[PDB]
Amino acid sequence: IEIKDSPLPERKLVTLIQESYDSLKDNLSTESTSNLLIKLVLEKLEKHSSLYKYIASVTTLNANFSLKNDIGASWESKKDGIFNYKLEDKNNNECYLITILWLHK
Amino acid sequence: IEIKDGRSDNSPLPERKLVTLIQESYDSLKDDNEINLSTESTSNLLIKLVLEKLEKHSSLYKYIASVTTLNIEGLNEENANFSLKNDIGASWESKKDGIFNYKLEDKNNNECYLITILWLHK
Incomplete structure (x- = not known):
């Protein structure tokens, strides 16, 4: 058992996530921001x-x-x-905490 | 890419036993008889207890x-x-x-916890 503290440098991980987000908050479904963010981030990783x-x-x-x-x-x-x-x-009164976990093959 | 279904019947044990596994671990940390001489937070102790029982x-x-x-x-x-x-x-x-x-x-501590368990078949 191990409490966890990469494939990409951290600065790229920030860019990866922040761009996916900004590209959403810049939709005719009812998909949530969080579910759309998850898909974007996983594609790009x-x-x-x-x-x-x-x-x-x-x-x-x-x-x-x-x-x-x-x-x-x-x-x-x-x-x-x-x-x-x-x-x-x-402005929409909402906060998002995203966690990326990578499992080395 | 797969969004994981929170209400799907996959687990190695039935959901009822998952709830109990988690509630009892939590109750064991909030019990007024418990002493924590480490600096580990409630959340981190919960994680260790839950993984052990799983x-x-x-x-x-x-x-x-x-x-x-x-x-x-x-x-x-x-x-x-x-x-x-x-x-x-x-x-x-x-x-x-x-x-x-x-x-x-x-x-009483103005705190809410949201716990997610993920099982990965080996």
Whole structure:
């Protein structure tokens, strides 16, 4: 058991996520922002490297609040890792916490 | 790309036993008789307890446990109107991999937890 603390440098991971988001908040379905963000991010990570499997998890929150995430795995691997990123939409009153988890093949 | 279905019957154990596994782990941390001499947060202790109990039930799966902690400052949390949801997607499709979501509230500490369990078939 290991609490987790990459295939891409972190700065690219930020760009990857922030662009997917801005491209949504810039739709005739009822798909949510969070579900659309998840699909975008997984597409683009898949294009970069096939050496990993990817999980993208998004908590949506709709004042003084803090939003944190923790993640543990039942196995240990220095090649598996996570990245957390927070996104806000001050006008629609919504906060997004996205976590990327990569599983080395 | 597959959005994982939170209400699908995939788990190595029935949902009822998943709820119990999680609630009891949580109750074991909030019990007034418990002493934590480490600096590990409730969320991180919950994750360790839940993964332990999942490993004992079935070794045929790898498990991931993710906890979001909402902490509200400046008003009592039961007087606030908010929603706290989670969605999860994976880069591959396994009919045997699945997820389960569960919400725990601590009204007295102005805290809400959203726990997600992911099982990956080996």
